[PDB]
Amino acid sequence: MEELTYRLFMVATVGMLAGTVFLLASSREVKPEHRRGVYISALVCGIAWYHYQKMGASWESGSYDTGLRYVDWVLTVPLMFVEVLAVTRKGAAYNEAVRNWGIAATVMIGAGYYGETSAAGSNEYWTGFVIAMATYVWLMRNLQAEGEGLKGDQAVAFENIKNLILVGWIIYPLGYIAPVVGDFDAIREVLYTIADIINKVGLGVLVLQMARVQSG
Ligand SMILES: CCCCCCCC/C=C/CCCCCCCC(=O)OC[C@H](O)CO
Numbered sequence: 001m002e003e004l005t006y007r008l009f010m011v012a013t014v015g016m017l018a019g020t021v022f023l024l025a026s027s028r029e030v031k032p033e034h035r036r037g038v039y040i041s042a043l044v045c046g047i048a049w050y051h052y053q054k055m056g057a058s059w060e061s062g063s064y065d066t067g068l069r070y071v072d073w074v075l076t077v078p079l080m081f082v083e084v085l086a087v088t089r090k091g092a093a094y095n096e097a098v099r100n101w102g103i104a105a106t107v108m109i110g111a112g113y114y115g116e117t118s119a120a121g122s123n124e125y126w127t128g129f130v131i132a133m134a135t136y137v138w139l140m141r142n143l144q145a146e147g148e149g150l151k152g153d154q155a156v157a158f159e160n161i162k163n164l165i166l167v168g169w170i171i172y173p174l175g176y177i178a179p180v181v182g183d184f185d186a187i188r189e190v191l192y193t194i195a196d197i198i199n200k201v202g203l204g205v206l207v208l209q210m211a212r213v214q215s216g
């Protein structure tokens, strides 16, 4: 799994760049008023492109640890919520959710990092898990509520955005927990890398599809 993990970091680098350039190029296919979420999506993929290059270099030198992923997540996880809010909200409601969901997302990642940087199964490990998991549930519940007012083709397009996050993000807390039940550290890195490509490029593509619906 060592060679596979390193090779997947390179695959992710290419995938994230491909997503960045796809989203930037496609941004003109929607009306200006509907582009902001597409641009944010492209920025998320570009940040992850930058970080997978850093994480591959760290792997080459033997200095890699899972904690390096958190430098990416602490910026990209809040921004992914923002890219959803950019297609679902306007005005004061947008500013309020960006603030509240962004704070929650940062707390989730920081609490996770506190637990990540301790021995697995330690008190700190569980403390970080409980706080991050509560925040995660709070975020997922607020994402489920976001669809309540949409109709027609926007409701369908939002359903896809919501479900990619609801299903696709389960792996992150699952991977955090699994090593206390079994020898799962190695497969955790493989699955997180695959998941990041699906979640980041996929969310951008689905935000673009929503913006196409809104423009049409
Ligand atoms: C030895 C290596 C084995 C590796 C084997 C592959 C593992 C891939 C895991 C990915 C986790 C994330 C998967 C996320 C999928 C979510 C899909 C979804 O819900 O998509 C909804 C969308 O609306 C549709 O249009």
Ligand SMILES: *C/C=C(C)/C=C/C=C(C)/C=C/C1=C(C)CCCC1(C)C
Pocket: 073, 076, 077, 080, 108, 109, 111, 112, 113, 128, 129, 132, 133, 136, 169, 172, 173, 176, 196, 199, 200
């Ligand atoms: C682009 C990368 C993404 C979307 C990463 C998402 C990360 C999380 C949702 C992580 C959440 C965690 C918990 C819910 C509990 C354990 C600690 C974390 C940080 C792994």
